[PDB]
């Protein structure tokens, strides 16, 4: 396994070089036909970021569709889908491959989106963080007028089935606003979200994605002066639950930050001393964020001062 592997590369390069040459010869000639499909097939599987070759595939299919029957064009499309699927198995994180699938489906008369949604569920089982796949999923969702609630139900199962949830939570942050479209979440939805994100971060307290989404939820409401007895009580209950969690995992910085954020949400002034205690522990546990933590602390001290001078 010495000269063998790196020898045949001089061969495998030779094929790519000749096929690539051939493709351009053929394209300069005006020969928009199956031969280009067959040659490009051989290059795009190994090298899907080779954008110009996706363009030829397009120029070929667009042209062919002019001088072939409905039924011969139908077959070409279906074969193009199978080819696309096989390229995705080899390389699922290439812009070109996904864009070409979107281009293909965008122009079909009767596209089968259900199948494409499932294609998405299959690739998100493989890699739940594949952003090409999530992006393509939203495109399919829109094209088939899928309803926010369907997609919200999809994100729920995904969240509980496993970790690797930053993409799912992100998707929920867009779906929820659509479910209650204001030109800013309602408290009942917010409370269900707090409960859901709360379970996540006690289940797996080192998974940052829950804590980020939670920090967002903490600001998405209506203010500390308008705290319902229920939200005051739930927020208080989260505070304690993070203190418990902090005993189990004293090296967990996300829970330390969240304790600071919760006290802010509840009553900046009543918790001023605890806020300062917590910045010291937190900076001790997460020293790389020292600078960030002092700036956040200065912002919060300023906030506090403004609140104290509003005293009549």
């Amino acid at each position: 396994q010495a000269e063998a592997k790196r020898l045949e590369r001089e061969q495998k390069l030779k094929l790519y070089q000749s096929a690539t040459q051939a493709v351009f010869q053929k394209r300069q000639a005006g020969e928009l036909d199956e031969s280009v499909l067959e040659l490009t097939s051989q290059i795009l599987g190994a090298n899907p970021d080779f954008a110009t070759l996706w363009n030829c595939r397009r120029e070929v299919l667009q042209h062919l569709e002019t001088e072939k029957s409905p039924e011969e064009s139908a077959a070409l499309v279906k074969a193009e889908l199978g080819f696309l699927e096989s390229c995705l198995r080899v390389n699922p994180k290439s812009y070109g491959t996904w864009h070409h699938r979107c281009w293909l489906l965008s122009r079909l008369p009767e596209p089968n989106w259900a199948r494409e949604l499932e294609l998405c569920a299959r690739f998100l089982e493989a890699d739940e963080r594949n952003f090409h796949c999530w992006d393509y999923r939203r495109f399919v969702a829109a094209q088939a007028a899928v309803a926010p609630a369907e997609e919200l139900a999809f994100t729920d199962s995904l969240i509980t089935r496993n970790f690797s949830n930053y993409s799912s939570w992100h998707y929920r942050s867009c779906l929820l606003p659509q479910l209650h479209p204001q030109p800013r979440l309602p408290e009942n939805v917010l409370l269900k979200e707090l409960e859901l994100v709360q379970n996540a971060f006690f289940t797996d307290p080192n998974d940052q994605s829950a804590w980020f989404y939670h920090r967002w939820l903490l600001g998405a409401g209506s203010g500390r002066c308008e705290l319902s007895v229920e939200k005051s009580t739930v927020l208080q209950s989260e505070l304690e639950s993070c203190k418990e969690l902090q005993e189990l995992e004293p090296e967990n910085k996300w829970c330390l930050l969240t304790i600071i954020l919760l006290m802010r949400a509840l009553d900046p002034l009543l918790y001023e001393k605890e806020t300062l205690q917590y910045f010291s522990t937190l900076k001790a546990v997460d020293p790389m964020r020292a600078a960030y933590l002092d700036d956040l602390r200065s912002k919060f001290l300023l906030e506090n001062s403004v609140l104290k001078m509003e005293y009549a």
Binding site: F24, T52, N55, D135, Y166, N206, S209, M288, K299
Partner: protein, 324 residues
């Protein structure tokens, strides 16, 4: 949790002269031919990094100017290589190269402008080429390109702004298109876009800044989004973004520096994505560009928006105001 652990032996010193040899020799080979498709950007990376090390003269100005003219198509857009199709990415790379060389009229500037203009949509987004892929990456290519040519006014700026901001997310970051998850690369494109269009006030600097500084892993290197291995070039996408929004002091400078240096190859030269891996000119540019932003003295100051030396941009008078 997912990180590299820097081997205790790994490089702790800047090997400038080696890198200048690495790039100077690059393209005299398997990998080279397989990336014909990004050649214009490859030349941009190599030239830019040489110029940051004060070594641009050791490259072929005259030969690259002819290559650039031959890569302009009749619709005005520039391709990555001769016979390849035009695209906003390579039109940007070309104009960056002509700006490094003060040779902008090597190409038909009016036709580039008309090409960028033709790619804008009703909603203000930019397609990357005639084939219609929409990405905030291209919003940045369009405006970066036009800014360098003094022709920003040629596109619908307000609608372009509106599209980008409609890609701002719950976490302060930005994605490909509306609804897309935040990622470092698009955040660099978007913050750079806002820098150019004078709209940094619409960024939530403390929230995004926090997201960007949590990218720094215990090893000191930055990843591009949560739960991913760190990597020298995010270390540039993230850092640049922080500089643009005024929060570069929110990452641990020294730990980052040690990561970047540890990404060098003492033998071949150049930098790799992570310690010990195979180098390339892309990462070589971005590791050098990162060190520059981190205050390293033997490299020129790099613009965090255009990723070119500040003196080139001073010299053409397009230096957007950053947050602080």
């Amino acid at each position: 949790q997912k990180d590299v652990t820097i081997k205790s032996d790994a490089p702790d010193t800047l090997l400038l002269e080696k890198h200048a040899d690495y790039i100077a020799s690059y393209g005299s080979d398997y990998e080279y031919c397989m990336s014909e498709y990004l050649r214009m950007s490859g030349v941009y990376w190599g030239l830019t990094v040489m110029d940051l090390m004060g070594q641009l003269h050791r490259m072929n100005k005259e030969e690259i100017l002819v290559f650039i003219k031959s890569c302009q198509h009749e619709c005005g857009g520039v391709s990555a290589s001769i016979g390849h199709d035009p695209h906003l990415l390579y039109t940007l790379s070309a104009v960056q190269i002509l700006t490094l060389y003060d040779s902008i009229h090597v190409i038909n500037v009016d036709k580039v402008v008309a090409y960028v203009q033709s790619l804008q949509k009703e909603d203000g987004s930019f397609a990357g080429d005639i084939w219609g892929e929409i990405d905030t990456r291209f919003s940045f290519c369009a405006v970066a390109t036009l800014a360098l040519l003094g022709k920003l006014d040629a596109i619908n700026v307000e609608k372009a702004i509106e599209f980008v901001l409609s890609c701002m997310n719950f976490d302060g970051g930005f994605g490909c298109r509306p609804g897309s998850e935040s990622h470092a690369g698009q955040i660099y494109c978007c913050t750079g876009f806002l820098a150019i269009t004078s709209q940094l006030h619409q960024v939530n600097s403390d929230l995004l800044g926090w997201w960007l500084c949590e990218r720094q892993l215990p090893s000191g290197g930055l990843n591009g989004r949560p739960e991913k291995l760190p990597d020298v070039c995010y270390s540039w996408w993230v850092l640049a973004s922080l500089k643009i929004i005024g929060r570069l002091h929110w990452i641990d400078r020294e730990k980052l520096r040690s990561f970047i240096l540890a990404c060098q190859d003492e033998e071949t030269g150049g930098f790799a994505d992570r310690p010990g891996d195979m180098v390339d000119p892309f990462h070589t540019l971005f590791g050098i560009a990162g060190l520059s932003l981190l205050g390293e003295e033997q490299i020129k100051p790099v613009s965090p928006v255009f990723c070119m030396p500040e003196e080139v941009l001073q010299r053409v008078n397009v230096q957007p105001e950053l947050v602080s």
